[PDB]
Amino acid sequence: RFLKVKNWETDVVLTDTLHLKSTLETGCTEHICMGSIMLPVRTKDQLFPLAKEFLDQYYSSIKRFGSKAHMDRLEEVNKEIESTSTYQLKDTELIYGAKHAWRNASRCVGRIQWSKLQVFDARDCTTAHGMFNYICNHVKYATNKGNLRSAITIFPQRTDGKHDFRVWNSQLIRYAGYKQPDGSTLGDPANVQFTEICIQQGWKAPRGRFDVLPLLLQANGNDPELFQIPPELVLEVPIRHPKFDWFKDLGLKWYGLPAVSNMLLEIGGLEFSACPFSGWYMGTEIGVRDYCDNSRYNILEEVAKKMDLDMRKTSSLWKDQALVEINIAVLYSFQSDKVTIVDHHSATESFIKHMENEYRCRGGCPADWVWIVPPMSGSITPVFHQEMLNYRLTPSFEYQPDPWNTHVWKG
Amino acid sequence: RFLKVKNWETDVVLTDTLHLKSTLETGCTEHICMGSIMLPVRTKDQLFPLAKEFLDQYYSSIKRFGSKAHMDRLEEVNKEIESTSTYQLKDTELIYGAKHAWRNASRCVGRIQWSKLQVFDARDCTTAHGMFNYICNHVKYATNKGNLRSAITIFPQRTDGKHDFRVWNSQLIRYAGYKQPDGSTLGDPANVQFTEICIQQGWKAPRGRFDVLPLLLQANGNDPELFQIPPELVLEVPIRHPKFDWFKDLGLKWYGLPAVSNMLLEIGGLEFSACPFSGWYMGTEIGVRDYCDNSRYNILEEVAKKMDLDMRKTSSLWKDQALVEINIAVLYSFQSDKVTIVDHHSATESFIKHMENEYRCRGGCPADWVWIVPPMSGSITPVFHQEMLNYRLTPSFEYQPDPWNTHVW
Ligand code: HEM
Ligand code: HEM
Ligand SMILES: Cc1cc(N)nc2cc(-c3cccc(CN)c3)ccc12
Ligand SMILES: Cc1cc(N)nc2cc(-c3cccc(CN)c3)ccc12
Ligand SMILES: C[C@H](O)[C@H](O)[C@H]1CNc2nc(N)[nH]c(=O)c2N1
Ligand SMILES: C[C@H](O)[C@H](O)[C@H]1CNc2nc(N)[nH]c(=O)c2N1
Ligand SMILES: [Zn+2]
């Protein structure tokens, strides 16, 4: 069965046959759309079908479907599952898996780059210290002195769920958030809960507005451990504005490497609960959400005041004005420092091309409009007028609960 | 299955039970979300359950559920259907139905005003001339000298689909769009085809940029007829900037009255194919969309030019910067001329409050995040961080094929 999408700006129509390869669920029914809901111990019984399905895909990609290489591998994985109740991925399989997880990530506007992922196999890792080492090397390789490279580091898969590897940080690099007694927050309000855990685990907090958080790392289901990323490895960019000289004086800076570390990579039924991945920022991620969200740094007012804007009535659109300037600054700062960044116009344009290419050579592209459209200036980017189909494919990146809610403490 | 929705900016959690009443379908499945798809004659037997459902909710709303009055009406409507193969709404049911179609319009951010709708019963209308009269009265009432008032005018219901009443215009008031020989487009590009149908029907185009289109009204499924709205009933706002003097020299204005006229209102199974309805603009509808969309006025570049912005790279965000100025101007102009308008911050804030109210007194509120989020400055408006459930309630407004595709000419 065919399914069609239309770009209402360009009248381009595309046909999705790939959605038929969709196994998982969306959360939607024929009577309800959960399209804007943020978030809507595995046995051998259901594992070999998930395995066979991955392997069939894999050997399809390398044009070896039904080959003896394919059949032997199936057999090999089978016997390993019925015997060991799990199985191991070959290096080739793991690399394929990681890339396609990204390719399948329907909420990711940056997926034009998916084929060029640097996959670091950390499956031999056994301790937090070993995790720390793998992560430093990720950060150094990915950062590349400001010339960012996509990378992911994959730690051992979950086994009985009692011996999980986890990076407790939501991102490898993020700034601390401190709740002051007076209710105000110093630092990043997003990170207050995690900051408190760190401090409790014995982190000595400098208590500044831009303190890089320590890595909190859990190996083999053991209590997590604190590590300080070496500062020379953390590339940061002071934020200034090209026309507004007082902007530097707001004292803002941001780190260069977006590296997400709390999601779960699923490949052929295997769950990799620690799998930090990194790319480079779209400017609005910092300038709109990080700085201007009401529940974050919320410097909109500060910027608006220094712009001497009419902050009395909202109909002056002073919020809108300040927001644009702040995003102008983020881009400007990053570009001046030769630190890789992409603006939301370039990135949405790229994604549209990616998406078309994907419909043509893959039969579709899962995409979550709610998430793909930029958090500012939506309709003047080309994805706003673009119809999209959302559906779940595997391999995939999944959400998982914060470890401090599920972890059994050793002591 | 008594679903929850979280606001991630406030942690407010609302419990939706209203969705379980939903009748129609979303277009989604467990395997695919179609939440970003623009667009996913009844028998004797289809019609009566539809009627009963409507009447049940009507008599529940007036706290006379299961009453003599209720049962009588149910009986009365039932009999009228069995014999006449349709039925007629009581005035009181007509008003309720209309008000609730707007209430249930999941894509509408302006629904906090839903119960203050002025309903105009035009079910006695028989001709296009009559339609023109009803529509002129609607426009004059709704406009109210700049102090806009919500209204709907309801023309006779469908019968056998051969005698449909239809307003061929998408909106009562819209600027013409002309295809220049050199290639591009003069006026309003969205209105290019309709502008031609009008000419192709005998309209004499002034071929200016802001030519108010004529009405093309169709009564009882006859050939449609051209009528010109008296210019004095069409309130327009000249667009100037509070800061930039050169702005007025762009020569821009917009009309005050948004009045959508191509949708179908469904109540208790009956189909009102002609039901123009109107309120007042959210600023972005004009400034973000009507002015700056590529397939529209696309004046962005021109504005940015006069602003002397670096239009060389996208990363200067000149489009964004200009976009914001244009929208400051629209609001400034409308407010200056005392023509009702709401900014996208105010309206979204109102909608959250409306959501609050609906979960509290109704148990929920169907909403389409994709359309409720304003086309600019999304995440700094409160609806962005607001989870919303989308489902189809009735009575409702629905899309319908453009008449020229259908009409037996
Ligand atoms: C290299 C340039 C990249 C850019 C510019 C980019 C951009 C983005 C943006 C803007 C979002 C929306 C998140 C938000 O706004 O809060 C997103 C989501 C996401 N990205 Fe990408 N990304 C890039 C690379 C990657 C890589 C390398 C991976 C993994 C290998 C990845 C995986 C994901 C996933 C899984 C999500 C959504 C998570 C979910 O489903 O909730 N991205 N990306
Ligand atoms: C009074 C002030 C009102 C405001 C500010 C308002 C605002 C809006 C906006 C911004 C949209 C998005 C459409 C677009 O962006 O092109 C919309 C859609 C819509 N409006 Fe409202 N509106 C108002 C009154 C009304 C009234 C009086 C009705 C009918 C009685 C109505 C019915 C609808 C419907 C049915 C849709 C979407 C149709 C669909 O579901 O596809 N609105 N409105
Ligand atoms: C790799 C990469 C690059 C980039 N530029 N942005 C990203 C954003 C996410 C993300 C996913 C879900 C929720 C959130 C909320 N902070 C962020 C994941 C990976 C990303
Ligand atoms: C009454 C009212 C006031 C207002 N301010 N905006 C409105 C927008 C629509 C609308 C609905 C679907 C599609 C489109 C695209 N032309 C527009 C309908 C009624 C409206
Ligand atoms: C493709 C997409 O669904 C389409 O452009 C929609 C998206 N959201 C919208 N939202 C509003 N308010 N108005 C619109 O016309 C649209 N267009
Ligand atoms: C409630 C809503 O689903 C939530 O705020 C989503 C909406 N769309 C988003 N889109 C992006 N890119 N990033 C986000 O964090 C969100 N948040
Ligand atoms: Zn859906």
- Asked whether residue B130 falls in the same domain as residue B231, the answer is yes
From residue A121, alpha-carbon distances to A98, A101, B321 in Å are 10, 15, 45
Q: Ligand 6 pocket, A33 CB below 6 A?
A: no
CA A291 – CA A254 distance, rounded (Å): 10
Question: Rounded to an integer, what distance in angstroms lies between the CA atom of residue B21 and that of residue B32?
Answer: 22
d(CA A236, CA B24) in angstroms, rounded, equals 52
* A204 and A72 housed in the same domain: no
Together in a domain, A20 and A156: yes
- Would you tell me how many other CB atoms lie within 10 Å of the CB of residue B305? 13
Residues 6+ apart with CB under 8 A from B372: B107, B109, B348, B351, B383, B388
Burial environment of residue B245 by CB neighbours within 10 A (0 to 12, 13 to 18, 19 or more): exposed
Both tokens assigned to B173 = 């008031």
User: Look-up: residue for tokens 């050579």?
Assistant: A361
Please name the residues in contact with B8: beta carbons below 8 A apart, sequence gap of 6 or more.
Answer: A38, A295, B385, B386, B387
The CA–CA distances, whole Å, from B95 to B63, B101, B153, B266 equal 17, 10, 11, 12
**b/e map A392-405, b = 16+ CB within 10 Å:** bbbbbbeeeeebbe
Say whether both A93 and A188 belong to one domain. no
In a domain, residue A315? The reply is: yes
- When CB atoms are compared, the residue of B29, B283, B387 closest to A38 is B387
Q: Which atom of ligand 6 is nearest to the CA of B6?
A: 1
Of A325, A328, A322, A333, the residue nearest A343 (C-alpha): A328
Distance CA B164, CA A208 (A): 69
Query: Is residue B66, in this structure, part of any structural domain at all?
Result: yes
Which of left, alpha, beta for B212 (phi over 0: left; psi -120 to 50: alpha)? beta
Inter-chain CB proximity A389 and B29 less than 8 Å: no
| Residues in a beta bridge with B260 | B171, B277
Test A376 with B380 for CB contact under 8 angstroms: yes
Rounded to the nearest angstrom, the distance between the alpha carbon of A225 and the centre of ligand 2 is: 54
B190 CA distance to ligand 5 centroid (A)? 15
Write the CB contacts of A45 (distance below 8 Å, at least 6 apart in sequence). none
CB contact under 8 A, B320 and A327: yes
In three-state form (DSSP H/G/I as H, E/B as E, the rest C), the secondary structure along A261-317 is: CCCEEEECCEEECCCCEECCEEHHHHHHHHHHCCCCCCCHHHHHHHCCCCCCCHHHC
Token duo for residue A140: 């150094």
Asked, for residue B380, whether it belongs to a domain, the answer is: no
Contact A16/A359 with Cβ under 8 angstroms? yes
Residue B65's CATH number: 3.90.340.10
* B77 lies in the same domain as B141: no
With a 6 Å cutoff on the Cβ, whether A282 touches ligand 1 is yes
* Structural domain span for residue B270: 16-123+150-160+264-278+348-372
A246 and A113 housed in the same domain:
no
CB burial class (10 A; 0-12, 13-18, 19+) of residue A149? Answer: middle
A398 three-state secondary structure: strand
A384 lies in some domain: no
Q: Does A405 touch chain B (CB under 8 A)?
A: no
Residues 6+ apart with CB under 8 A from A22: A366, A391, A392, A393, B31, B32
- A220 and A86 within one domain: no
Same domain, B315 and B362: no
Experimental method: X-ray
* Residues recorded for chain B: 409
Radius of gyration of chain A (CA): 23
The chain A residue lying nearest B296, using CA atoms, is: A9
Subunit contact B28:A25, Cβ cutoff 8 A: no
Query: Is B6 among the domain residues?
Result: no
The verdict on B332 and B355 lying in the same domain is no
Q: Is B285 a catalytic residue?
A: yes
Same domain assignment for residues A254 and A336: yes
Whichever domain contains B208, its CATH number is 3.90.440.10
Q: What is the CATH number of the domain that holds B299?
A: 3.90.1230.10
Count up the domains in chain B and report the number: 3
What are the residues whose beta carbons fall under 8 Å from the beta carbon of A286, sequence distance 6 or more?
A254, A330
Q: How far is the C-alpha of B403 from the C-alpha of B170, rounded, in Å?
A: 11
Whether A377 is covered by a domain: the verdict is no
| Residue A351, CA distances (Å) to A110, A386, B31, B210, B356 in order | 7, 11, 23, 36, 36
Question: Ligand nearest B109 Cα, by number?
Answer: 2
Tell me how many degrees the CA angle A285-A261-A59 measures, rounded to the nearest 5: 105
Scan residues 350-389 of B and list those with Cβ closer than 8 Å to A.
Answer: 368-370, 373-380, 384-389
The answer on B133 and B73 residing in a single domain is no
Type of residue found at A350: S
Helix, strand or coil, per DSSP, at residue B371: helix
CA-nearest of A86, A90, A83 to A69 is A90
Q: Which ligand is nearest to the CA of B388?
A: 6
Residues forming a β-bridge with B187: B177
Beta strands at B4-6 and A396-398: parallel, antiparallel or unpaired: unpaired
Element (H, E) at B75: helix B68-84
Q: Is A30 within 8 Å of B26 when comparing Cβ atoms?
A: yes
Residue B197 and residue B316 in one domain = no
Q: How far apart are CA B383 and CA A308, in angstroms?
A: 27
Q: Is residue B390 part of a domain?
A: no
Q: Find where tokens 């394919």 sit.
A: A70
Q: Report CA(A375)–ligand 6 centroid distance (Å).
A: 8
Cβ A346 vs Cβ B314: under 8 Å? yes
Contact at 8 Å (CB) between A42 and A269? yes
Tell me if the bond preceding A156 is cis, omega within 30° of 0. no
**Is residue B4 assigned to a domain?**
no
- Determine the straight-line distance between the first and last CA of chain B, rounded to whole angstroms: 50
3-class state of residue B71 by DSSP: helix
**Active-site hit among B93, B102, B103, B111:** B111
Q: Please, are residues B14 and B5 in contact by the beta-carbon 8 Å criterion?
A: yes
Known binder of ligand: residue A399? yes
| DSSP assignment string, B201-270 | TT------SSPBPPEEEE-TT---EEEPPPGGG--EEE---SS-GGGGGG--EEES--EE-S-EEEETTE
